[PDB]
Amino acid sequence: ERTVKGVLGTKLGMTQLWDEHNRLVPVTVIQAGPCVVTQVRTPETDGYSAVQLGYGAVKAKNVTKPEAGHFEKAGVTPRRHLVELRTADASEYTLGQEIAADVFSESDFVDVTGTSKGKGTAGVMKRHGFGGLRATHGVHRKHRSPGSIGGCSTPGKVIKGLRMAGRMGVERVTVQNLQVHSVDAERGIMLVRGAVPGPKGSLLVVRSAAKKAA
Amino acid sequence: MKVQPSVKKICDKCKVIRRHGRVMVICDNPRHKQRQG
Amino acid sequence: TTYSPKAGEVQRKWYVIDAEDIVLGRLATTAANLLRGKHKPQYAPHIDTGDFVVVVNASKIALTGKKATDSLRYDHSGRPGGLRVTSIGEMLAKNPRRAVERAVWGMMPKNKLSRQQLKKLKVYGGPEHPHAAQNPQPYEITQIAQ
Amino acid sequence: SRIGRLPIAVPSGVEVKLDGQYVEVKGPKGTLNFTVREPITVSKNDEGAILVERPDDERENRSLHGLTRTLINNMVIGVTEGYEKKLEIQGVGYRVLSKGPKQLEFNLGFSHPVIVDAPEGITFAVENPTKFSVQGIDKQVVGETAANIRKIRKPEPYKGKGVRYEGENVRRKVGKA
Amino acid sequence: GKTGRKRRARRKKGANHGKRPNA
RNA sequence: GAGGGAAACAGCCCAGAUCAUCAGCUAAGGCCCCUAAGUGGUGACUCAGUGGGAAAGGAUGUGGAGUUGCGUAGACAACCA
RNA sequence: CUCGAUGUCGGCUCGUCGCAUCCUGGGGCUGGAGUCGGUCCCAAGGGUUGGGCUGUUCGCCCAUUAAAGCGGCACGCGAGCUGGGUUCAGAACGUCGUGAGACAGUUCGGUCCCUAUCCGCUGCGCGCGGAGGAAUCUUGAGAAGGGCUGUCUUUAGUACGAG
RNA sequence: CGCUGAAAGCAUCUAAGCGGGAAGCACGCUUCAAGAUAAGGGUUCCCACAGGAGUGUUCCUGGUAAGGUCCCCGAGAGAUG
Ligand SMILES: [Mg+2]
Ligand SMILES: [Mg+2]
Ligand SMILES: [Mg+2]
Ligand SMILES: [Mg+2]
Ligand SMILES: [Mg+2]
Numbered sequence: 073e074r075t076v077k078g079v080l081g082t083k084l085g086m087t088q089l090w091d092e093h094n095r096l097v098p099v100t101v102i103q104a105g106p107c108v109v110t111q112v113r114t115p116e117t118d119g120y121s122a123v124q125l126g127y128g129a130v131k132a133k134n135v136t137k138p139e140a141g142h143f144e145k146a147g148v149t150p151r152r153h154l155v156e157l158r159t160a161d162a163s164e165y166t167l168g169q170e171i172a173a174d175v176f177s178e179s180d181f182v183d184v185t186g187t188s189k190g191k192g193t194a195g196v197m198k199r200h201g202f203g204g205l206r207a208t209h210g211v212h213r214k215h216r217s218p219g220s221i222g223g224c225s226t227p228g229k230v231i232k233g234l235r236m237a238g239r240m241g242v243e244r245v246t247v248q249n250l251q252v253h254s255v256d257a258e259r260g261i262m263l264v265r266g267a268v269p270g271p272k273g274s275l276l277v278v279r280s281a282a283k284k285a286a
Numbered sequence: 287m288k289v290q291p292s293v294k295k296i297c298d299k300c301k302v303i304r305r306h307g308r309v310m311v312i313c314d315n316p317r318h319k320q321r322q323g
Numbered sequence: 324t325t326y327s328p329k330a331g332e333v334q335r336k337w338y339v340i341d342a343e344d345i346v347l348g349r350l351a352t353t354a355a356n357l358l359r360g361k362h363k364p365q366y367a368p369h370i371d372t373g374d375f376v377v378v379v380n381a382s383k384i385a386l387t388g389k390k391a392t393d394s395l396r397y398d399h400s401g402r403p404g405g406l407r408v409t410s411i412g413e414m415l416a417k418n419p420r421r422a423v424e425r426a427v428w429g430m431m432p433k434n435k436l437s438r439q440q441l442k443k444l445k446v447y448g449g450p451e452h453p454h455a456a457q458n459p460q461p462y463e464i465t466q467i468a469q
Numbered sequence: 470s471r472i473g474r475l476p477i478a479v480p481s482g483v484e485v486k487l488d489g490q491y492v493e494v495k496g497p498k499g500t501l502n503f504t505v506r507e508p509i510t511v512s513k514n515d516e517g518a519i520l521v522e523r524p525d526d527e528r529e530n531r532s533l534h535g536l537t538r539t540l541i542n543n544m545v546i547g548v549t550e551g552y553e554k555k556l557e558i559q560g561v562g563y564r565v566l567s568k569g570p571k572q573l574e575f576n577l578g579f580s581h582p583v584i585v586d587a588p589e590g591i592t593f594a595v596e597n598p599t600k601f602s603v604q605g606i607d608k609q610v611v612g613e614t615a616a617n618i619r620k621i622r623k624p625e626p627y628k629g630k631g632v633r634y635e636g637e638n639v640r641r642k643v644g645k646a
Numbered sequence: 647g648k649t650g651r652k653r654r655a656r657r658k659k660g661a662n663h664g665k666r667p668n669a
Numbered sequence: 670g671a672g673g674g675a676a677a678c679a680g681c682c683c684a685g686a687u688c689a690u691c692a693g694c695u696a697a698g699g700c701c702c703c704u705a706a707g708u709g710g711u712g713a714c715u716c717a718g719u720g721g722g723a724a725a726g727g728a729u730g731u732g733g734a735g736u737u738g739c740g741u742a743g744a745c746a747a748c749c750a
Numbered sequence: 751c752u753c754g755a756u757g758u759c760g761g762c763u764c765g766u767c768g769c770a771u772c773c774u775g776g777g778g779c780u781g782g783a784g785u786c787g788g789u790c791c792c793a794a795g796g797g798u799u800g801g802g803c804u805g806u807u808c809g810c811c812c813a814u815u816a817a818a819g820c821g822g823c824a825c826g827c828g829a830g831c832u833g834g835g836u837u838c839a840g841a842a843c844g845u846c847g848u849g850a851g852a853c854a855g856u857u858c859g860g861u862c863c864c865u866a867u868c869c870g871c872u873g874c875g876c877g878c879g880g881a882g883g884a885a886u887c888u889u890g891a892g893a894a895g896g897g898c899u900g901u902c903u904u905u906a907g908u909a910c911g912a913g
Numbered sequence: 914c915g916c917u918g919a920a921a922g923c924a925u926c927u928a929a930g931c932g933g934g935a936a937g938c939a940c941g942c943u944u945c946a947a948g949a950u951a952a953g954g955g956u957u958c959c960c961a962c963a964g965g966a967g968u969g970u971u972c973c974u975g976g977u978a979a980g981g982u983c984c985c986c987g988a989g990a991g992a993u994g
């Protein structure tokens with residue numbers, strides 16, 4: 073229902089800048105490269121309004137026949153990635169249209185979505201901030217234990233949703249209201265004030281800020 | 287408003303009504319407003 | 324030896340019921356009876372001999388008293404504080420199919436066969452259904468005197 | 470229903486269409502419409518009046534009888550004469566002004582002026598910075614609009630400051646005796 | 647108690663005739 | 670002390686299992702669906718989901734039956750002195 | 751009910767639920783000048799501090815805070831921890847007993863264990879199905895998380911008030 | 914807290930109806946999600962193979978297409994998968 077502008081990019085890393093109030097600002101560098109409209113979704117044929125964007129450099133021998141046919145119908149060269157943008161203005165998008173970082177101006181607030189860095193199987197003390205037990209005073213082989221995990225004969229069970237150890241990281245995380253610092257479209261570079269999820273080289277979705285601003 | 291199981295006329299101007307299944311006392315004087323509960 | 328149906332021996336038909344201004348209880352009892360095939364002399368509890376029921380206009384099911392806002396339906400996700408509750412009026416407005424299926428399932432035996440048979444109930448809140456190919460015949464809820 | 474059993478006299482220029490359960494009332498001031506509850510019927514009584522009949526002498530029959538009689542009489546008297554309500558404001562610094570027949574601006578001691586829009590059938594009429602009025606063709610709508618205007622700043626029991634009805638008997642006491 | 651009250655009130659069912667073990 | 674009823678439920682209700690039966694009639698309890706048999710017939714009452722837990726006390730809920738005061742010398746409300 | 755064993759206080763850890771609401775939200779009556787208050791309703795979304803004393807619960811106190819809620823869950827939680835208290839054998843004091851000894855009197859000291867089978871729960875795979883076999887992008891029935899709050903500035907020394 | 918308004922000639926937030934009204938309810942925000950066996954939808958690719966039995970072809974073997982896995986080099990991933 074909401075109209076969203078969007079673009080796809082790659083997390084190149086971070087550096088720092090100084091703003092006009094001489095304030096040090098951390099900036100993430102996103103190679104908000106050229107994206108092409110591979111497919112437009114309409115209520116008539118698909119049931120919702122969204123725009124599928126491409127983006128990515130792919131080797132010709134690593135694109136299969138179904139993907140090649142999809143891109144041939146789109147009328148564009150094959151791209152590595154394909155990500156949709158749920159926008160209510162999908163129609164205004166034509167098949168094969170060119171999208172560049174200049175879709176965002178010098179002070180727009182954006183939401184950046186990416187897959188967070190993985191940590192493997194994490195303990196409770198790390199993946200949930202559990203305070204363990206003391207290091208001394210008789211603590212017996214339970215320094216990083218989760219403590220109790222329930223009650224007693226009532227309910228004689230462990231409630232669903234209890235926080236215990238497990239695999240943390242590698243998940244969809246959206247960080248909101250990041251003010252774009254600068255856009256240089258002729259080389260497809262975006263400087264966004266903040267820290268975005270994911271390791272260097274990961275795919276990032278930069279969309280217009282859902283909550284507009286602070 | 288006073289919420290009491292026992293609501294009665296206090297003055298001569300108070301009126302007892304049944305509103306939305308509850309017995310209430312309405313009066314020009316706001317002190318006499320009552321509701322069963 | 325008493326007769327017993329053989330798998331596909333009993334031919335299953337398609338009925339359509341217009342739930343227009345019909346009480347939910349009567350609609351659900353009729354649907355359960357039809358789905359289980361209790362109106363057939365070939366009935367057998369262990370073999371599905373019932374018919375398919377297509378209910379239309381489920382959004383206009385009649386409710387008596389203050390049921391539309393005081394008769395509640397509960398679901399629990401299985402975790403603490405995982406209860407949701409919604410009134411039958413809201414459920415008929417939003418997802419009438421869920422309401423009709425809940426009523427019919429409650430009125431139907433608690434069986435694997437009953438679970439299978441409940442899939443034969445096709446509930447649509449509007450006046451139109453997509454099963455013209457199956458050619459459902461209209462069914463009128465009636466009573467037999469004395 | 471002693472109220473209901475009394476007839477309703479249709480005045481000149483008022484068109485009363487009794488299309489079964491649904492009724493139209495045309496007049497010089499506008500148009501109103503209403504549906505009577507089912508166990509109550511309406512007749513013309515020689516086309517010069519209106520009658521409402523309860524089919525039984527139960528409670529809901531009599532109650533809806535009186536209700537429908539009063540409400541039909543209200544719509545006809547509205548379409549033949551309208552509805553008027555006078556609201557007066559007391560307290561220093563309080564003012565009301567008009568940006569048109571359907572737009573009011575109130576300075577009721579707030580931080581900023583407050584804007585009041587009117588519905589289509591509601592028209593305001595201000596004559597004094599401390600007195601104004603609302604008119605319409607629906608008694609219920611006029612009454613609720615006046616109620617909202619009063620709710621903006623209801624009278625107080627200390628210095629009366631607030632929008633009050635013209636005949637409102639506002640209570641009052643004394644704090645710092 | 648609620649449990650005791652329900653246990654005592656169970657004797658009012660039709661098939662029982664106003665009596666039930668443990669009241 | 671099985672069987673039927675009581676949701677489940679040694680002590681309550683019905684009823685005392687010799688075995689077989691793919692016969693019939695009943696008991697308690699039941700007859701919209703779960704669940705076998707009535708969404709039974711006729712006349713009232715309830716609209717609280719009361720039915721399907723509870724007290725002192727409280728209440729212009731609603732139906733019915735009285736007793737009694739006043740009243741077209743004109744009653745009760747509403748409206749002018 | 752359990753004596754062919756259902757481990758008993760407080761803290762730690764982890765929560766979850768009730769509302770008989772401590773704060774924050776809304777409203778009546780009072781009021782109450784205002785400022786504040788106090789009381790009868792609503793309301794459980796979130797939040798509800800750190801220390802001194804004592805084994806303590808409780809309680810008192812210090813310094814804060816929007817506030818430092820009350821309760822249930824085997825007085826939640828020892829196959830999660832703690833062993834300071836309690837309730838073993840040592841010893842001492844007081845009291846009692848002729849004495850062995852006794853004391854919900856006091857004091858110092860004082861062993862526990864468990865590689866998780868089943869359910870439960872946090873994660874992660876394999877299989878098969880999804881009426882041909884595939885590749886990509888998805889809808890969301892439904893599920894979970896999140897929901898706190900202060901101070902200052904301004905409106906304005908305005909409203910109110912004799913000040 | 915109301916508006917209109919009877920039953921009850923008035924009145925009444927209520928009996929018909931309409932409006933306001935909280936950090937609560939449901940959304941809004943974020944995340945998982947078709948084992949949702951109701952197993953969804955769009956787009957794209959591959960194609961009517963071979964040999965036996967057969968009993969409407971059925972079904973069982975065999976080589977493939979699109980595509981995928983094994984194996985190897987790794988990390989932005991990871992206990993092992
Ligand atoms: Mg630590
Ligand atoms: Mg250690
Ligand atoms: Mg258990
Ligand atoms: Mg008690
Ligand atoms: Mg015997």
Ligand SMILES: [Mg+2]
Binds near residue numbers: 670
């Ligand atoms: Mg027996």
Ligand SMILES: [Mg+2]
């Ligand atoms: Mg029995």
Ligand SMILES: [Mg+2]
């Ligand atoms: Mg039984």
Ligand SMILES: [Mg+2]
């Ligand atoms: Mg018989």
Ligand SMILES: [Mg+2]
């Ligand atoms: Mg009998």
Ligand SMILES: [Mg+2]
């Ligand atoms: Mg059963």
Ligand SMILES: [Mg+2]
């Ligand atoms: Mg009948």
Ligand SMILES: [Mg+2]
């Ligand atoms: Mg009957």
Ligand SMILES: [Mg+2]
């Ligand atoms: Mg009740």
Ligand SMILES: [Mg+2]
Binds near residue numbers: 721
């Ligand atoms: Mg009840």
Ligand SMILES: [Mg+2]
């Ligand atoms: Mg009672």
Ligand SMILES: [Mg+2]
């Ligand atoms: Mg044992």
Ligand SMILES: [Mg+2]
């Ligand atoms: Mg409460």
Ligand SMILES: [Mg+2]
């Ligand atoms: Mg809480």
Ligand SMILES: [Mg+2]
């Ligand atoms: Mg809740």
Ligand SMILES: [Mg+2]
Binds near residue numbers: 808809
């Ligand atoms: Mg103490």
